[PDB]
Design a protein around this ligand. Structure first.
Ligand SMILES: Cc1ncc(COP(=O)(O)O)c(CNCC(=O)O)c1O
Ligand SMILES: Cc1ncc(COP(=O)(O)O)c(CNCC(=O)O)c1O
Lengths: 468, 472
């Protein structure tokens, strides 16, 4: 007999168990009628979910559900084909148009997932420019890492958010060498934020494209939820609404969001659905549409799923109260943790990473929270984060009111004592250690938005179907 | 001064226009209440869709829609996370269990899409066995090609369905070399079918894994729609229903479907939804679950989308009349075309590829069909097929009854005259092409009804798999 395939797999699975990164998924059945509750195996066994990426609770929004129900009745479930063959349609057109409008770009292209979007764009760039050099933040997501490998070009990794190191790398190449700077706006495991504007400045100076993943930012930053790039020119964007502003927030001609060449997002988090996208110039979009195999050779997302996301995007654009209440909830939890010496990785975003520092203790903390306190928070271990930096990821939403927060705070405090986990004081004696939303921005209401953001009559893009 | 990025893209887009493979997508709005009709830009402007991969018309089935509606009311739209974080749930468990049941495997794992499934499995195998040699059918789908590139291992391409050439390639390595044979059951562009059994025999003899893409076969072949692998032991599977058969169709211990190491499918065709999967041993599934980044680091499909597919799978398992009526519809169209000398690439499957032979004429035929006859059929050109072999792809379903077929036949006949396209006779004069000049479903199999299935397929109490969540 030949190779021992079963032996190779056995030993590979055993390494996961011995190093204790072997994952057990929790049966979590999220309740649309009782957000943010979920049930486990039994309907009667409920927990409060504190680690979902349904950041704005739009997965259960009436306009999202209604859009789904109506679309299902008209279109059915599946698209029934690919974009080329029988799977191109009005829900697709409306969604691409909505995303392009959100990022104030010429075009947007929808993919199965942002994982696929990231892989497709990065792969194609590298496969069509073999001389390309990619500069990648060390904390970039798996999707981007995989895309960068697939691109199959020279790559440099820079220390996280270290723009001195990035500039030194950029500088060591002639300007005429094609370059790509690949980064995220908000890094999900730490909640850290990129200086998008400074990166755009570096791109201008050294002749690089910019690729920006706003997956943990869309819905959440900027007056309309277009992301951190929008937040960079918050007041310009707020004044102009849907329109491109006359000037950026410093009185210059171009906004940050305009200067970024390629912006990717998800429909699977804030926008309450599933899918991915890239927003960019008409030329870039047409190129991806025409050449990306991960776009071309795959069933189109169901119409209903697209209709849902479109509804979510439209609603959130003109409901800044979603963001203000999320930020308030987050800040409430963060300040309560600070007072109790519960160690939170400091960040200016909506993510609350509670530092544990140990794989087994993080899993046990998660275990006790769900079984004893009916709180669902997931442990983040290697390989998603560095060994020794293990943590619990907590993500408050507009639905996590202060009464629910109080229960969380009490439970986490309690679990820290039960496991005798290190407090902030203890960490100081012995790691990974200031808010994007300002008080000014946090006191805005929906009345302070440009009325042109309420039910815009958004027209379909020619590029979605092909250009004459 | 800086690289001309816009220049590179412009010239790249211009190559598509000059070679005339630059695609214009049709606005096709499929109507659940009026299958297989769709509207274009205006609701009033309707066409009949004849090139959908909604092969069993289950995208609009009441049990599918009802499953979606109820799931949406309970769960909402999005999963709200990945499988690891807040996106693992009962709809997921039920779907994976249903797929494992269908293929009579220990486990199944759901992905965003079969494109992603294929890429993930192939990538991982090659990344974890760098000495692996992959033997790949020349007509394998882009997803598999890309997966095989990503695997980043030695690859041999064998001529399409040529198991003599495959054997000679396999033979030129010692048995102890790790090997993978990657192939499809049904190839969508001409409807050809693999000899899965002979490939399993070659894998046994030369010590290879088998990777089988049944994307154009699930729902459609075998008594329960488990695919061509099931069709290989049709009678054993039919007798045993959902249970593993006592013997295969030759009286041996193991069925072909059991001997295939990895089977991938889609939820986006027959099963009327979206998504992909692999069915395999518990060990393999646990491995993909634990290691495939394309599985791990992506939002879970919406619960409703999973619930829809589950309903579609359960329904089709015990409705063999879906397959018999599809095959009859296909055979009706094929034989009508034969009588009219409309050239169809001969195949034993459910696909009707009408040979045009010219890129411009195929697009014009498609154009005239939709604008003049309200028939939507897509032209297939280079690079999807060889230049000179361009064609129209027609895919009948249970919903394409003979009245609709008659309209299609009439329209295609009409278009052939309008464009003075070559008939079968005309191709024969030039020496034939691609067989223009049997059948998986036999007469015996085609006269089976739902009463001839094992009752254990009706409402199986399918139990959730431990491997879906993790094994201790
Ligand atoms: C930063 C980031 N980028 C891209 C993706 C992929 O997008 P989709 O989920 O639409 O496939 C994820 C998903 N993973 C979420 C997480 O890292 O917690 C992500 O977190
Ligand atoms: C043979 C084959 N394999 C895999 C896939 C990918 O499946 P998803 O659509 O679920 O990603 C497809 C898609 N069908 C493309 C075509 O008919 O050319 C396919 O045809």
């Amino acid at each position: 007999s030949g190779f021992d395939y079963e032996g190779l797999i056995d030993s590979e699975l055993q390494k996961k168990r011995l190093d204790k990164s072997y994952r057990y998924f929790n049966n979590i059945n999220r309740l649309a009628k009782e957000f943010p509750l979920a049930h486990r195996q039994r309907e009667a066994d409920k927990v409060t979910v504190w680690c979902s990426n349904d950041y704005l609770a739009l997965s259960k929004h009436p306009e999202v559900l209604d859009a789904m129900h109506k679309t299902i009745d008209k279109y059915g479930c599946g698209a029934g084909g690919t974009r080329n063959i029988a799977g191109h349609n009005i829900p697709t057109l409306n969604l691409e148009a909505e995303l392009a409008t959100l990022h104030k770009k010429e075009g947007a292209l929808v993919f199965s997932s942002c994982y696929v979007a990231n892989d497709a764009v990065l792969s194609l760039l590298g496969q069509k420019m073999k001389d390309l050099v990619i500069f990648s933040d060390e904390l970039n997501h798996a999707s981007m890492i995989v895309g960068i490998k697939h691109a199959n070009v020279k790559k440099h990794i820079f220390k996280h958010n270290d723009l001195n190191e990035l500039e030194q790398l950029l500088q060591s190449y002639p300007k005429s060498v094609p370059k790509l700077i690949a980064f995220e706006s908000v890094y999900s495991m730490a909640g850290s934020v990129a200086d998008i504007e400074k990166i755009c400045d570096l791109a201008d100076k050294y002749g690089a494209l910019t690729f920006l993943d706003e997956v943990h930012a869309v819905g959440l930053y900027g007056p309309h939820g277009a992301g951190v790039a929008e937040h960079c020119d918050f007041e310009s964007h707020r004044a102009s609404g849907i329109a491109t502003p006359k000037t950026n927030d410093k009185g210059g001609a171009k906004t940050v969001m305009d200067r970024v060449d390629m912006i990717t997002g998800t429909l699977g988090k804030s926008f309450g659905s599933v899918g991915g996208y890239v927003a960019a110039s008409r030329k870039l979009i047409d190129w991806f549409r025409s050449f990306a195999p991960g776009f071309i050779f795959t069933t189109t997302l169901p119409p209903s799923v697209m209709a849902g996301a479109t509804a979510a995007i439209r609603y959130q654009r003109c409901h800044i109260d979603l963001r203000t209440s999320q930020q308030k909830h987050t800040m409430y939890v963060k300040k309560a943790f600070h007072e109790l010496g519960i160690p939170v990785i400091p960040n200016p975003s909506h993510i609350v990473p509670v530092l544990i520092g140990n794989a087994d203790l993080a899993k046990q903390a998660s275990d006790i929270l769900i079984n004893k306190h009916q709180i669902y928070v997931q442990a983040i271990n290697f390989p998603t984060v560095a060994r020794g930096t293990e943590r619990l990821r907590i993500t408050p939403t507009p639905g996590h009111t202060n009464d629910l927060s109080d229960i969380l705070i009490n439970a986490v405090d309690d679990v820290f004592n039960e496991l005798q986990l290190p407090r902030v004081r203890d960490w100081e004696s012995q790691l990974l250690g200031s808010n994007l939303w300002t008080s000014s921005q946090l006191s805005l209401t929906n009345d302070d938005l440009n009325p042109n953001v309420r039910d815009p009559i958004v027209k379909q893009l020619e590029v979605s179907s092909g250009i004459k």
